[PDB]
Motif scaffolding. Structure first.
Motif, PDB file in Angstrom:
ATOM      1  N   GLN A  37       0.809  -1.213   0.000  1.00  0.00           N
ATOM      2  CA  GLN A  37       0.000   0.000   0.000  1.00  0.00           C
ATOM      3  C   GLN A  37       0.834   1.251   0.000  1.00  0.00           C
ATOM      4  N   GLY A  56      -3.118   5.278   2.982  1.00  0.00           N
ATOM      5  CA  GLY A  56      -3.859   4.440   3.942  1.00  0.00           C
ATOM      6  C   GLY A  56      -5.002   3.642   3.304  1.00  0.00           C
ATOM      7  N   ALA A  57      -4.645   2.688   2.435  1.00  0.00           N
ATOM      8  CA  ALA A  57      -5.604   1.926   1.643  1.00  0.00           C
ATOM      9  C   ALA A  57      -5.781   0.498   2.144  1.00  0.00           C
ATOM     10  N   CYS A  58      -5.336   0.192   3.348  1.00  0.00           N
ATOM     11  CA  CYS A  58      -5.491  -1.170   3.874  1.00  0.00           C
ATOM     12  C   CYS A  58      -6.897  -1.720   3.712  1.00  0.00           C
ATOM     13  N   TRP A  59      -7.888  -0.895   4.062  1.00  0.00           N
ATOM     14  CA  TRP A  59      -9.299  -1.252   3.950  1.00  0.00           C
ATOM     15  C   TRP A  59      -9.729  -1.651   2.546  1.00  0.00           C
ATOM     16  N   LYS A  66     -12.439   7.478   3.442  1.00  0.00           N
ATOM     17  CA  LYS A  66     -11.639   8.659   3.265  1.00  0.00           C
ATOM     18  C   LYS A  66     -10.509   8.470   2.292  1.00  0.00           C
ATOM     19  N   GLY A  73      -6.987   8.311   3.428  1.00  0.00           N
ATOM     20  CA  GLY A  73      -7.065   8.661   4.860  1.00  0.00           C
ATOM     21  C   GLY A  73      -7.630   7.513   5.697  1.00  0.00           C
ATOM     22  N   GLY A  74      -7.930   6.364   5.077  1.00  0.00           N
ATOM     23  CA  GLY A  74      -8.606   5.247   5.739  1.00  0.00           C
ATOM     24  C   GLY A  74     -10.039   5.005   5.287  1.00  0.00           C
ATOM     25  N   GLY A  75     -10.629   3.926   5.793  1.00  0.00           N
ATOM     26  CA  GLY A  75     -11.927   3.476   5.294  1.00  0.00           C
ATOM     27  C   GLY A  75     -12.388   2.183   5.905  1.00  0.00           C
ATOM     28  N   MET A  85     -14.157  -1.700   5.188  1.00  0.00           N
ATOM     29  CA  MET A  85     -14.421  -2.778   4.238  1.00  0.00           C
ATOM     30  C   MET A  85     -15.911  -2.909   3.934  1.00  0.00           C
ATOM     31  N   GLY A 103     -10.712  -6.106  10.748  1.00  0.00           N
ATOM     32  CA  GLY A 103      -9.850  -5.120  11.380  1.00  0.00           C
ATOM     33  C   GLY A 103      -8.959  -5.670  12.447  1.00  0.00           C
ATOM     34  N   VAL A 143      -8.772  -1.558  16.978  1.00  0.00           N
ATOM     35  CA  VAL A 143      -8.368  -1.898  15.638  1.00  0.00           C
ATOM     36  C   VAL A 143      -8.007  -0.630  14.830  1.00  0.00           C
ATOM     37  N   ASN A 144      -6.983  -0.728  13.986  1.00  0.00           N
ATOM     38  CA  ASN A 144      -6.540   0.418  13.192  1.00  0.00           C
ATOM     39  C   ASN A 144      -6.122   0.054  11.756  1.00  0.00           C
ATOM     40  N   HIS A 145      -6.359  -1.200  11.361  1.00  0.00           N
ATOM     41  CA  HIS A 145      -5.803  -1.725  10.123  1.00  0.00           C
ATOM     42  C   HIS A 145      -6.717  -2.825   9.568  1.00  0.00           C
ATOM     43  N   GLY A 146      -7.001  -2.770   8.274  1.00  0.00           N
ATOM     44  CA  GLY A 146      -7.907  -3.758   7.620  1.00  0.00           C
ATOM     45  C   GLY A 146      -6.997  -4.768   6.943  1.00  0.00           C
ATOM     46  N   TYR A 153     -14.688  -6.717  13.806  1.00  0.00           N
ATOM     47  CA  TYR A 153     -15.392  -6.116  12.670  1.00  0.00           C
ATOM     48  C   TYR A 153     -15.082  -6.917  11.432  1.00  0.00           C
TER      49      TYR A 153
END
Ligand SMILES: *C(=N)C1(NC(=O)[C@@H]2C[C@@H](S(=O)(=O)c3ccc(O[C@@H](C)C(F)(F)F)cc3Cl)CN2C(=O)C2(C(F)(F)F)CC2)CC1
Length: 219
Positions: free
Chosen positions: A20, A24-27, A66, A69-71, A73, A139, A164-167, A213
């Motif tokens: 990635q 912040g595209a883990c999700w 986002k 900026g994150g998101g 699933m 997550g 949790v902070n990461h998908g 989640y």
């Protein structure tokens, strides 16, 4: 009864590990991962689906993603449902940046009809879903350097919380040398972990929030 060991890579349902980078595209990587699995199972084709298409096109009030900026699933899946599809990565490549949506239905590579949310904290339901449905988006708390440095065995860190902070993607489970684990595909590249994978403690009190989640799509 469920099998003692599952690894979806053995059935050709998992695409290569992705990197990635700065975005912040883990999700989005977790969500296309899960849909990739279903796509292989329902059509026999294994194709990397466009994380970028999710990053660019779901960054609005309706979803609350986002982009870089994150998101979430779950919202990725809903974008795909509403949108009537998603492109393959080959036609909508990853740029690790926020760009304006350029989805084109003529390049549609997969659809989604609904998604399933699993019960909060329920490692038995996660095990059932992973065994009987396919890889599952989840997550985790990946806030500790012990996660970052993992290479072998089973990750278990008493400083992990349910924050949790990461998908990521669970593509299996098992028991290694007496310790139950979840088999997780990360999106921090091939050099992270074991060729991009980490084995994380299973049946250890929802460790790192891994069953908090959880969701998977239906084609
Ligand atoms: C990935 N590069 C990175 N992380 C994210 O984008 C993470 C992934 C999810 S989460 O952390 O798994 C998460 C957190 C909280 C919830 O609560 C549910 C009930 C809610 F709010 F959605 F209704 C679910 C999940 Cl799946 C979200 N996330 C984030 O960074 C946040 C956001 F950007 F999406 F807002 C939540 C902060 C570093 C970017």
């Amino acid at each position: 009864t469920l099998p003692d060991t599952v690894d979806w890579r053995e059935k050709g349902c998992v695409t290569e590990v992705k990197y990635q980078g700065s975005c912040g595209a883990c999700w989005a990587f977790s969500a296309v991962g899960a849909l990739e699995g279903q796509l292989k199972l329902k059509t026999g084709k294994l194709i990397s689906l466009s994380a970028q298409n999710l990053v660019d096109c779901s960054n609005e009030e309706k979803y609350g993603n986002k982009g870089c900026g994150g998101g979430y699933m779950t919202e990725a899946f809903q974008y795909i449902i509403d949108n009537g599809g998603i492109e393959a990565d080959a036609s909508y490549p990853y740029k690790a940046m926020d760009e304006k949506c350029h989805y084109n239905s003529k390049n549609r590579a997969a659809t989604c009809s609904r998604y399933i949310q699993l019960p909060f904290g329920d490692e038995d339901a996660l095990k059932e879903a992973v065994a009987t449905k396919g890889p599952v988006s989840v997550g985790i708390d990946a806030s500790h350097s012990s996660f970052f440095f993992y290479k072998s065995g089973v990750y278990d860190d008493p400083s992990c919380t349910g924050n949790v902070n990461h998908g990521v993607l669970v593509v299996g489970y098992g028991t290694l040398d007496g310790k139950d684990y979840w088999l997780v595909k990360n999106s921090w590249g091939l050099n992270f972990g074991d060729q991009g994978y980490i084995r994380m403690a299973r049946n250890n009190k929802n460790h790192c929030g891994i069953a908090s989640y959880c969701s998977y799509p239906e084609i």
